[PDB]
Amino acid sequence: QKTYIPWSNGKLVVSEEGRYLKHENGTPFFWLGETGWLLPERLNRDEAEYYLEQCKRRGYNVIQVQTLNNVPSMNIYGQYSMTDGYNFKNINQKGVYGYWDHMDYIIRTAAKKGLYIGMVCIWGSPVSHGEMNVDQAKAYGKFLAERYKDEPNIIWFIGGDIRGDVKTAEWEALATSIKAIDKNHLMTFHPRGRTTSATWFNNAPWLDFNMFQSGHRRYGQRFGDGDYPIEENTEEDNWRFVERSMAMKPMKPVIDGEPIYEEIPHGLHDENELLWKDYDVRRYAYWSVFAGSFGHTYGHNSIMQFIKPGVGGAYGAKKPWYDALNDPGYNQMKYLKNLMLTFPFFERVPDQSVIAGQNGERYDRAIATRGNDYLMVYNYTGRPMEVDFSKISGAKKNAWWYTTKDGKLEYIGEFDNGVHKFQHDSGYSSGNDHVLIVVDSSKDYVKKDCYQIDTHE
Numbered sequence: 167q168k169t170y171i172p173w174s175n176g177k178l179v180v181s182e183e184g185r186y187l188k189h190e191n192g193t194p195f196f197w198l199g200e201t202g203w204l205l206p207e208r209l210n211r212d213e214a215e216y217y218l219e220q221c222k223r224r225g226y227n228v229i230q231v232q233t234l235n236n237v238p239s240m241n242i243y244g245q246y247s248m249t250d251g252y253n254f255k256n257i258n259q260k261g262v263y264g265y266w267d268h269m270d271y272i273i274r275t276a277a278k279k280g281l282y283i284g285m286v287c288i289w290g291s292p293v294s295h296g297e298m299n300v301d302q303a304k305a306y307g308k309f310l311a312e313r314y315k316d317e318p319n320i321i322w323f324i325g326g327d328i329r330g331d332v333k334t335a336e337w338e339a340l341a342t343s344i345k346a347i348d349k350n351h352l353m354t355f356h357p358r359g360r361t362t363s364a365t366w367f368n369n370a371p372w373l374d375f376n377m378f379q380s381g382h383r384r385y386g387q388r389f390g391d392g393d394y395p396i397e398e399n400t401e402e403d404n405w406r407f408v409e410r411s412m413a414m415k416p417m418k419p420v421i422d423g424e425p426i427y428e429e430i431p432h433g434l435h436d437e438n439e440l441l442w443k444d445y446d447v448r449r450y451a452y453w454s455v456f457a458g459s460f461g462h463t464y465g466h467n468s469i470m471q472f473i474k475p476g477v478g479g480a481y482g483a484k485k486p487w488y489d490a491l492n493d494p495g496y497n498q499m500k501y502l503k504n505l506m507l508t509f510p511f512f513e514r515v516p517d518q519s520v521i522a523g524q525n526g527e528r529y530d531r532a533i534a535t536r537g538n539d540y541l542m543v544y545n546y547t548g549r550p551m552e553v554d555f556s557k558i559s560g561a562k563k564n565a566w567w568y569t570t571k572d573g574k575l576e577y578i579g580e581f582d583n584g585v586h587k588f589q590h591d592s593g594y595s596s597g598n599d600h601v602l603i604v605v606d607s608s609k610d611y612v613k614k615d616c617y618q619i620d621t622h623e
Contacts, residue, residue, distance in 0.1 A: 170623035171280045172227060173318045178352050180374055181512050184417040186460040187352070187375070194511040197421060197461025198503045199228040199284060200496075201470040206231055206269050208472040210242050214272050217472075220491050222279040225500035225621070228321060229276060230284035230356075230423070230463060233269065233310075237288070237297035241265050252302040254309040266313070273317055282319045284463075285310075286356055287344075290328025293336055300339045307343025315348035322353040323423075327379065329358045330366025341372040356423050359383070360395045364411035368418060375460070376411045377423035380404035380450060382442070384432040385528070404450050405457035405533060408516075412458050419460040425450040427465035428495035430481050437482035441467075445546075445597030447495035448570050449529070451502050452544045452599070456533040458516040464499045466490050494571070500621065501573035505601065507622035509611050510537045517541075522585045523552040529595065539606035544570075546599045550589040553602060555581060560606030564614065568601040574618045580607060 176190025187195040200221045209217060221229060239247035245265040250256065257266060273283050287310060288298060298306065314320050324341045341353060352374040355363035362378035383401040388394070400406055404422055411420040428447050431439040451462045468490035473479040475486060490496065506514075518525070520534035520541050532551050534543045539559045545551060555563045565578040567590055578588075581604075592598040605611055612619070 169222075169278070169280050172282070177318075177350060178321070180352070180419060183512055185412075185419055185458065185515070186512055187419060188512070194507065195227075195461075196503050196506050196511075197228050197463070198226050198499055199230055199421075199423070199461070199463030200226040201424070201427065201463060201465035202229050202472070203232045203286075203470045204235065204472050205229065206233060206265075206272060207235055207239055207241050208474075211268070211271060213472075215275050217487070218272075218276050218279050218281060222281060224497060225503045226464075227280065228282045228284050228461075228463070230323065231272075231286065232289045232326065233285045234288040234292070237292045239265065241268055243268065252298075252305040254305065257309070270313075273314070273319065277317070277319045282321050284321045284323050285314075286323040286326045287340060289326035290332075290358075291326075293326075293333050294328055298333075298336055298340075300335050303336045303339035304343045307340045308347060311344045311347035315350050318350075320351045322348075322351055323356045323377075324353060324372075325355040325357055325363070327356065327358060327424075329361060330355060330363060334366070338370075338372075341370070345372045354421075354423070358395075359424075360401070362407050362411045362420070364414050364418075364420065368411070368414040369416070373418070375419040375421065377421055378404075378407040378411060379424040380407055380422050380454070381424050381426045381465070382430055382432070382434050384440075387433045389433070389435060402450075402528070403453075403531075405453045408454055408457035408459050421459045421461050421463065422450065422454040423463050424465060425454065425463070427467045427470060428493055429483070429485070429490070430465075430467040434481050441482075443597070444494035444498060444571070445599065448498060448502075448599055449546050451499065452546075452570065452601070453533055455502065455506065456516060456535040456542065456544050458535070462499070462502060464496065466493060466496055469496070498571055501570055501619070504573060504619045504622045505542075505568060508619050509540050509542075509605075513537045517557065520554055520557045521551060522554045525551070539609050540611065541604045543602045543604075544599065545590065545602065547595040548590050548592055548598065548600070549594070550587060551602075552585050552587050553604065554585045555604060556583040556585075558604070558606060560608055562607035563604050564607050564612075565605075566603040566612060568603050568619065570599050570601065571597075572618075575603075575612065575616055577614050577616075
Protein backbone atom coordinates (compact mmCIF):
# COMPACT_ATOMS: atom_id res chain seq x y z
CA GLN A 167 0.00 0.00 0.00
CA LYS A 168 1.08 3.64 -0.69
CA THR A 169 2.91 5.51 2.08
CA TYR A 170 1.12 8.52 3.51
CA ILE A 171 2.90 11.78 2.56
CA PRO A 172 1.85 14.69 4.82
CA TRP A 173 3.06 17.39 2.47
CA SER A 174 0.89 16.07 -0.37
CA ASN A 175 -1.62 18.21 1.55
CA GLY A 176 0.66 21.22 1.18
CA LYS A 177 3.26 22.86 3.36
CA LEU A 178 2.88 23.33 7.12
CA VAL A 179 1.18 26.50 8.31
CA VAL A 180 0.11 27.83 11.66
CA SER A 181 -3.71 27.56 11.82
CA GLU A 182 -5.90 30.76 12.11
CA GLU A 183 -6.68 30.28 15.83
CA GLY A 184 -2.93 30.35 16.59
CA ARG A 185 -2.91 26.97 18.41
CA TYR A 186 -2.26 24.22 15.86
CA LEU A 187 -0.35 23.27 12.75
CA LYS A 188 -2.12 22.47 9.53
CA HIS A 189 -1.29 21.79 5.90
CA GLU A 190 -2.22 24.42 3.26
CA ASN A 191 -5.31 22.37 2.37
CA GLY A 192 -6.65 22.63 5.93
CA THR A 193 -5.61 19.11 6.92
CA PRO A 194 -4.52 18.79 10.55
CA PHE A 195 -0.94 17.98 11.33
CA PHE A 196 -0.59 16.26 14.65
CA TRP A 197 3.07 16.43 15.33
CA LEU A 198 4.36 13.19 16.87
CA GLY A 199 8.07 13.60 17.25
CA GLU A 200 10.83 11.12 17.88
CA THR A 201 14.24 12.14 19.15
CA GLY A 202 17.13 10.96 16.93
CA TRP A 203 19.68 13.58 17.94
CA LEU A 204 22.77 11.72 16.72
CA LEU A 205 21.23 10.22 13.58
CA PRO A 206 23.49 12.21 11.19
CA GLU A 207 26.61 11.57 13.22
CA ARG A 208 26.21 7.90 14.23
CA LEU A 209 24.19 5.90 11.70
CA ASN A 210 25.16 4.69 8.26
CA ARG A 211 22.83 4.48 5.26
CA ASP A 212 21.36 1.06 6.14
CA GLU A 213 20.95 1.84 9.83
CA ALA A 214 19.30 5.21 9.05
CA GLU A 215 16.83 3.62 6.68
CA TYR A 216 15.95 1.03 9.35
CA TYR A 217 15.58 3.62 12.09
CA LEU A 218 13.37 5.82 9.91
CA GLU A 219 11.17 2.90 8.76
CA GLN A 220 10.69 1.72 12.34
CA CYS A 221 9.63 5.20 13.51
CA LYS A 222 7.24 5.43 10.59
CA ARG A 223 5.61 2.14 11.55
CA ARG A 224 4.95 3.59 14.98
CA GLY A 225 3.24 6.83 13.91
CA TYR A 226 6.05 9.33 14.29
CA ASN A 227 6.04 12.04 11.62
CA VAL A 228 8.88 14.31 12.85
CA ILE A 229 12.42 13.13 13.55
CA GLN A 230 14.44 15.61 15.60
CA VAL A 231 18.14 15.56 14.87
CA GLN A 232 21.25 17.46 15.65
CA THR A 233 22.37 18.54 12.20
CA LEU A 234 25.67 19.43 13.86
CA ASN A 235 26.71 18.50 17.41
CA ASN A 236 30.22 20.00 17.18
CA VAL A 237 32.28 22.27 15.01
CA PRO A 238 33.13 20.47 12.91
CA SER A 239 30.97 17.41 13.28
CA MET A 240 32.02 13.90 12.24
CA ASN A 241 29.85 11.12 10.86
CA ILE A 242 30.18 7.35 10.97
CA TYR A 243 32.07 7.31 7.67
CA GLY A 244 34.75 9.62 9.12
CA GLN A 245 33.65 12.68 7.12
CA TYR A 246 33.87 16.26 8.43
CA SER A 247 30.84 18.58 8.31
CA MET A 248 33.22 21.48 7.44
CA THR A 249 36.37 21.08 5.40
CA ASP A 250 37.30 24.82 5.22
CA GLY A 251 35.78 26.49 8.25
CA TYR A 252 32.53 28.27 7.48
CA ASN A 253 33.36 28.52 3.82
CA PHE A 254 30.93 26.12 2.08
CA LYS A 255 31.71 27.04 -1.53
CA ASN A 256 33.57 23.76 -2.08
CA ILE A 257 31.76 21.58 0.40
CA ASN A 258 30.66 19.19 -2.37
CA GLN A 259 33.37 17.05 -3.95
CA LYS A 260 32.85 14.89 -7.01
CA GLY A 261 33.18 11.14 -6.29
CA VAL A 262 33.11 11.74 -2.51
CA TYR A 263 30.20 10.81 -0.21
CA GLY A 264 30.52 13.71 2.25
CA TYR A 265 28.91 14.62 5.53
CA TRP A 266 26.18 16.65 3.78
CA ASP A 267 25.60 14.03 1.11
CA HIS A 268 24.77 11.69 3.97
CA MET A 269 22.50 14.36 5.53
CA ASP A 270 20.81 14.68 2.13
CA TYR A 271 20.28 10.90 2.11
CA ILE A 272 18.79 10.90 5.59
CA ILE A 273 16.38 13.68 4.63
CA ARG A 274 15.36 12.05 1.29
CA THR A 275 14.93 8.64 2.86
CA ALA A 276 12.71 10.27 5.51
CA ALA A 277 10.76 11.89 2.71
CA LYS A 278 10.00 8.53 1.08
CA LYS A 279 8.58 7.47 4.44
CA GLY A 280 6.42 10.56 4.92
CA LEU A 281 8.64 11.92 7.74
CA TYR A 282 9.80 15.46 8.46
CA ILE A 283 13.33 15.98 9.73
CA GLY A 284 13.43 18.48 12.63
CA MET A 285 16.78 20.08 11.87
CA VAL A 286 18.57 21.51 14.93
CA CYS A 287 21.03 23.39 12.75
CA ILE A 288 23.72 23.41 15.44
CA TRP A 289 23.44 22.23 19.00
CA GLY A 290 23.90 24.95 21.62
CA SER A 291 27.15 23.70 23.22
CA PRO A 292 29.52 24.56 20.43
CA VAL A 293 27.82 27.93 20.02
CA SER A 294 27.99 28.91 23.73
CA HIS A 295 31.66 27.82 23.60
CA GLY A 296 32.31 30.43 20.81
CA GLU A 297 32.56 28.18 17.77
CA MET A 298 29.94 30.16 15.75
CA ASN A 299 30.04 33.97 15.67
CA VAL A 300 27.57 36.27 13.96
CA ASP A 301 29.33 36.13 10.57
CA GLN A 302 29.75 32.34 10.72
CA ALA A 303 26.04 31.99 11.63
CA LYS A 304 25.00 33.92 8.50
CA ALA A 305 27.33 31.88 6.33
CA TYR A 306 25.95 28.60 7.77
CA GLY A 307 22.28 29.68 7.60
CA LYS A 308 22.67 30.60 3.94
CA PHE A 309 24.32 27.25 3.22
CA LEU A 310 21.49 25.34 4.93
CA ALA A 311 18.72 27.39 3.34
CA GLU A 312 20.13 27.17 -0.21
CA ARG A 313 20.70 23.46 0.16
CA TYR A 314 17.43 22.48 1.75
CA LYS A 315 14.77 25.10 0.91
CA ASP A 316 13.33 22.83 -1.81
CA GLU A 317 13.31 19.65 0.20
CA PRO A 318 9.71 19.25 1.35
CA ASN A 319 10.23 17.56 4.69
CA ILE A 320 12.13 20.07 6.86
CA ILE A 321 11.29 21.92 10.08
CA TRP A 322 14.07 24.29 11.34
CA PHE A 323 15.16 24.20 15.00
CA ILE A 324 17.19 27.19 16.11
CA GLY A 325 19.07 26.78 19.39
CA GLY A 326 19.50 23.34 20.99
CA ASP A 327 19.42 23.03 24.80
CA ILE A 328 20.41 26.66 25.31
CA ARG A 329 18.80 29.77 26.77
CA GLY A 330 17.54 32.35 24.30
CA ASP A 331 19.54 35.07 26.14
CA VAL A 332 22.80 33.18 25.45
CA LYS A 333 24.47 34.00 22.10
CA THR A 334 21.21 35.69 21.07
CA ALA A 335 22.79 37.71 18.26
CA GLU A 336 24.27 34.53 16.82
CA TRP A 337 20.93 32.67 16.93
CA GLU A 338 19.06 35.67 15.40
CA ALA A 339 21.65 35.80 12.60
CA LEU A 340 21.19 32.10 11.87
CA ALA A 341 17.39 32.21 11.98
CA THR A 342 17.03 35.35 9.83
CA SER A 343 19.63 34.14 7.29
CA ILE A 344 17.68 30.91 6.79
CA LYS A 345 14.23 32.61 6.62
CA ALA A 346 15.60 35.17 4.13
CA ILE A 347 16.18 32.39 1.62
CA ASP A 348 13.81 29.60 2.75
CA LYS A 349 10.13 30.58 2.72
CA ASN A 350 9.05 26.95 2.56
CA HIS A 351 9.51 25.65 6.11
CA LEU A 352 8.46 26.50 9.66
CA MET A 353 10.94 27.38 12.39
CA THR A 354 11.17 27.09 16.20
CA PHE A 355 13.78 27.36 18.97
CA HIS A 356 14.79 24.43 21.18
CA PRO A 357 15.53 25.90 24.62
CA ARG A 358 17.34 25.01 27.85
CA GLY A 359 15.86 22.55 30.30
CA ARG A 360 12.98 23.95 32.34
CA THR A 361 12.57 26.92 29.94
CA THR A 362 10.36 27.85 26.99
CA SER A 363 11.36 29.60 23.78
CA ALA A 364 8.40 31.88 24.36
CA THR A 365 10.30 33.66 27.13
CA TRP A 366 12.72 35.18 24.61
CA PHE A 367 11.22 34.73 21.11
CA ASN A 368 7.41 34.66 21.26
CA ASN A 369 7.28 37.84 19.11
CA ALA A 370 10.28 36.98 16.91
CA PRO A 371 9.03 37.09 13.33
CA TRP A 372 11.15 34.09 12.36
CA LEU A 373 9.58 31.92 15.09
CA ASP A 374 6.42 30.19 13.88
CA PHE A 375 5.77 28.19 17.04
CA ASN A 376 7.22 27.84 20.51
CA MET A 377 9.01 24.89 22.05
CA PHE A 378 9.99 23.99 25.61
CA GLN A 379 12.15 21.34 27.28
CA SER A 380 10.39 19.89 30.36
CA GLY A 381 12.96 17.04 30.88
CA HIS A 382 14.48 15.59 32.87
CA ARG A 383 14.24 16.34 36.62
CA ARG A 384 11.68 14.96 39.02
CA TYR A 385 9.77 17.03 41.56
CA GLY A 386 12.06 18.97 43.95
CA GLN A 387 15.25 17.79 42.36
CA ARG A 388 17.92 20.48 42.78
CA PHE A 389 21.69 20.28 42.61
CA GLY A 390 22.28 23.71 44.09
CA ASP A 391 20.65 26.76 45.59
CA GLY A 392 21.29 29.21 42.71
CA ASP A 393 18.80 30.80 40.33
CA TYR A 394 16.03 28.48 39.05
CA PRO A 395 13.77 29.17 36.02
CA ILE A 396 10.76 27.48 37.56
CA GLU A 397 8.90 27.37 40.82
CA GLU A 398 10.06 24.85 43.47
CA ASN A 399 8.48 21.36 43.25
CA THR A 400 6.89 21.89 39.79
CA GLU A 401 9.50 20.05 37.65
CA GLU A 402 7.01 17.39 36.39
CA ASP A 403 4.15 19.81 35.78
CA ASN A 404 4.97 20.26 32.04
CA TRP A 405 1.43 21.66 31.53
CA ARG A 406 2.77 24.81 33.28
CA PHE A 407 5.21 25.52 30.40
CA VAL A 408 2.24 25.30 28.05
CA GLU A 409 0.04 27.82 29.97
CA ARG A 410 2.84 30.32 30.41
CA SER A 411 3.88 30.05 26.78
CA MET A 412 0.42 30.49 25.26
CA ALA A 413 -0.39 33.32 27.73
CA MET A 414 2.22 35.47 25.96
CA LYS A 415 0.47 37.35 23.14
CA PRO A 416 0.08 37.33 20.27
CA MET A 417 -0.48 33.63 20.87
CA LYS A 418 1.53 31.02 18.92
CA PRO A 419 1.42 27.23 19.08
CA VAL A 420 3.67 25.46 21.61
CA ILE A 421 5.04 21.95 22.02
CA ASP A 422 7.16 19.98 24.47
CA GLY A 423 10.17 19.33 22.23
CA GLU A 424 12.08 17.46 24.94
CA PRO A 425 10.21 15.93 27.82
CA ILE A 426 11.70 13.21 29.98
CA TYR A 427 13.26 10.39 27.94
CA GLU A 428 12.26 6.82 28.49
CA GLU A 429 14.87 4.91 30.56
CA ILE A 430 16.82 8.09 31.39
CA PRO A 431 17.73 8.70 35.07
CA HIS A 432 15.78 11.27 37.11
CA GLY A 433 17.87 14.42 36.79
CA LEU A 434 20.52 12.95 34.49
CA HIS A 435 23.49 13.33 36.92
CA ASP A 436 23.12 10.05 38.78
CA GLU A 437 23.41 7.00 36.55
CA ASN A 438 21.98 4.93 39.44
CA GLU A 439 18.81 7.01 40.05
CA LEU A 440 15.34 5.84 39.18
CA LEU A 441 14.67 5.69 35.48
CA TRP A 442 11.70 7.39 33.81
CA LYS A 443 9.27 4.69 32.60
CA ASP A 444 6.52 4.31 30.05
CA TYR A 445 3.83 5.55 32.48
CA ASP A 446 5.90 8.73 33.06
CA VAL A 447 6.37 9.21 29.29
CA ARG A 448 2.65 8.99 28.71
CA ARG A 449 1.86 11.38 31.56
CA TYR A 450 4.14 14.09 30.12
CA ALA A 451 2.62 13.52 26.61
CA TYR A 452 -1.02 13.82 27.58
CA TRP A 453 -0.37 16.62 30.13
CA SER A 454 1.31 18.76 27.50
CA VAL A 455 -1.24 18.12 24.76
CA PHE A 456 -4.27 18.45 27.04
CA ALA A 457 -2.70 21.69 28.34
CA GLY A 458 -2.87 23.03 24.77
CA SER A 459 0.25 21.82 22.91
CA PHE A 460 -0.37 21.10 19.23
CA GLY A 461 1.48 17.78 19.34
CA HIS A 462 4.25 16.04 21.28
CA THR A 463 7.86 14.86 20.94
CA TYR A 464 8.94 11.61 22.58
CA GLY A 465 12.48 10.60 23.43
CA HIS A 466 14.37 7.51 24.62
CA ASN A 467 17.74 7.49 26.36
CA SER A 468 19.23 4.80 24.05
CA ILE A 469 17.69 5.98 20.79
CA MET A 470 18.56 9.68 20.98
CA GLN A 471 22.27 8.88 21.23
CA PHE A 472 22.08 5.72 19.11
CA ILE A 473 23.83 3.58 21.62
CA LYS A 474 25.64 0.63 20.11
CA PRO A 475 27.62 -2.21 21.62
CA GLY A 476 31.18 -0.87 22.03
CA VAL A 477 29.90 2.64 22.77
CA GLY A 478 28.51 3.17 26.25
CA GLY A 479 25.97 5.88 26.65
CA ALA A 480 25.74 8.90 28.73
CA TYR A 481 23.22 8.84 31.56
CA GLY A 482 23.62 5.08 32.13
CA ALA A 483 22.34 3.98 28.67
CA LYS A 484 23.49 0.38 27.87
CA LYS A 485 20.67 -1.01 25.74
CA PRO A 486 21.36 -0.61 21.99
CA TRP A 487 19.08 1.81 20.09
CA TYR A 488 17.78 -1.02 17.91
CA ASP A 489 16.66 -2.95 21.03
CA ALA A 490 15.07 0.19 22.51
CA LEU A 491 12.62 0.17 19.50
CA ASN A 492 10.75 -2.55 21.46
CA ASP A 493 10.36 -0.49 24.64
CA PRO A 494 6.76 0.31 25.74
CA GLY A 495 6.75 4.14 25.78
CA TYR A 496 8.15 4.38 22.23
CA ASN A 497 5.35 2.02 21.13
CA GLN A 498 2.51 3.89 22.90
CA MET A 499 2.82 7.38 21.43
CA LYS A 500 0.74 6.30 18.41
CA TYR A 501 -2.35 5.98 20.65
CA LEU A 502 -2.02 9.71 21.44
CA LYS A 503 -1.80 10.66 17.76
CA ASN A 504 -4.72 8.37 16.89
CA LEU A 505 -6.84 9.88 19.66
CA MET A 506 -6.36 13.54 18.81
CA LEU A 507 -6.95 12.95 15.09
CA THR A 508 -10.30 11.26 15.85
CA PHE A 509 -11.99 14.56 16.89
CA PRO A 510 -12.58 18.07 15.51
CA PHE A 511 -9.03 19.36 15.56
CA PHE A 512 -8.84 23.15 15.32
CA GLU A 513 -11.53 24.24 17.74
CA ARG A 514 -9.87 22.29 20.58
CA VAL A 515 -8.95 24.29 23.65
CA PRO A 516 -7.67 23.44 27.09
CA ASP A 517 -10.33 23.92 29.77
CA GLN A 518 -9.92 22.94 33.41
CA SER A 519 -13.51 24.14 34.13
CA VAL A 520 -14.62 20.84 32.55
CA ILE A 521 -13.43 19.38 35.86
CA ALA A 522 -15.87 20.19 38.68
CA GLY A 523 -15.30 19.77 42.43
CA GLN A 524 -11.87 19.63 43.97
CA ASN A 525 -9.16 18.50 41.53
CA GLY A 526 -6.07 16.64 42.71
CA GLU A 527 -2.47 17.83 43.10
CA ARG A 528 0.64 16.60 41.35
CA TYR A 529 -0.07 13.22 39.62
CA ASP A 530 -3.75 13.41 40.79
CA ARG A 531 -4.36 16.63 38.82
CA ALA A 532 -6.86 15.66 36.13
CA ILE A 533 -6.42 17.69 32.96
CA ALA A 534 -9.14 18.52 30.47
CA THR A 535 -9.43 19.72 26.91
CA ARG A 536 -12.47 20.12 24.67
CA GLY A 537 -13.92 21.11 21.37
CA ASN A 538 -17.48 22.37 20.91
CA ASP A 539 -19.15 18.98 20.84
CA TYR A 540 -16.63 16.76 22.70
CA LEU A 541 -14.42 16.77 25.73
CA MET A 542 -11.62 14.72 27.17
CA VAL A 543 -10.26 14.31 30.62
CA TYR A 544 -6.94 12.62 31.26
CA ASN A 545 -6.65 10.94 34.62
CA TYR A 546 -3.24 9.54 35.45
CA THR A 547 -3.95 8.08 38.93
CA GLY A 548 -7.59 7.10 38.60
CA ARG A 549 -8.66 9.41 41.49
CA PRO A 550 -12.45 9.91 41.24
CA MET A 551 -13.45 13.03 39.40
CA GLU A 552 -16.44 15.15 38.59
CA VAL A 553 -16.98 16.17 34.97
CA ASP A 554 -19.28 18.99 33.79
CA PHE A 555 -20.96 17.88 30.55
CA SER A 556 -22.72 21.28 30.09
CA LYS A 557 -19.37 22.66 28.82
CA ILE A 558 -20.09 21.20 25.35
CA SER A 559 -23.10 20.99 23.05
CA GLY A 560 -25.73 18.23 23.12
CA ALA A 561 -28.74 17.39 25.30
CA LYS A 562 -27.39 13.82 25.64
CA LYS A 563 -23.72 12.77 25.77
CA ASN A 564 -22.00 9.45 25.08
CA ALA A 565 -19.00 8.54 27.26
CA TRP A 566 -16.10 6.09 26.75
CA TRP A 567 -12.95 5.06 28.55
CA TYR A 568 -9.72 5.20 26.58
CA THR A 569 -6.71 3.40 28.01
CA THR A 570 -3.52 5.10 26.77
CA LYS A 571 -1.13 2.16 26.99
CA ASP A 572 -3.11 0.06 24.44
CA GLY A 573 -5.46 2.45 22.62
CA LYS A 574 -8.49 0.37 23.66
CA LEU A 575 -11.88 1.98 23.93
CA GLU A 576 -14.66 0.97 26.35
CA TYR A 577 -18.21 2.33 26.02
CA ILE A 578 -19.70 3.53 29.31
CA GLY A 579 -23.20 4.79 28.35
CA GLU A 580 -25.25 7.97 27.82
CA PHE A 581 -25.73 10.89 30.20
CA ASP A 582 -27.46 14.27 30.53
CA ASN A 583 -25.85 17.74 30.87
CA GLY A 584 -25.30 17.39 34.60
CA VAL A 585 -22.02 17.14 36.45
CA HIS A 586 -21.22 13.39 36.62
CA LYS A 587 -18.75 11.47 38.76
CA PHE A 588 -16.40 8.91 37.22
CA GLN A 589 -13.89 6.41 38.47
CA HIS A 590 -12.12 3.93 36.17
CA ASP A 591 -12.00 0.24 37.23
CA SER A 592 -8.22 0.00 37.60
CA GLY A 593 -5.55 0.16 40.26
CA TYR A 594 -5.20 3.54 41.91
CA SER A 595 -2.00 5.31 40.97
CA SER A 596 -0.83 2.23 39.02
CA GLY A 597 0.25 3.70 35.68
CA ASN A 598 -3.03 2.64 34.14
CA ASP A 599 -3.80 6.14 32.97
CA HIS A 600 -6.97 6.81 31.05
CA VAL A 601 -9.00 9.39 29.17
CA LEU A 602 -12.68 9.91 29.64
CA ILE A 603 -14.06 10.65 26.17
CA VAL A 604 -17.39 12.49 26.19
CA VAL A 605 -19.16 13.34 22.94
CA ASP A 606 -22.38 15.07 21.96
CA SER A 607 -24.85 12.23 21.30
CA SER A 608 -25.75 13.76 17.93
CA LYS A 609 -22.15 13.39 16.65
CA ASP A 610 -20.46 10.09 15.73
CA TYR A 611 -16.68 10.62 15.91
CA VAL A 612 -16.53 7.43 17.98
CA LYS A 613 -18.97 4.49 17.70
CA LYS A 614 -20.71 2.87 20.70
CA ASP A 615 -19.67 -0.61 19.48
CA CYS A 616 -16.11 0.63 18.71
CA TYR A 617 -13.54 -1.28 20.87
CA GLN A 618 -10.40 0.73 19.91
CA ILE A 619 -9.40 3.87 18.09
CA ASP A 620 -7.78 2.78 14.85
CA THR A 621 -4.57 4.02 13.37
CA HIS A 622 -4.83 7.45 11.80
CA GLU A 623 -2.20 7.92 9.07
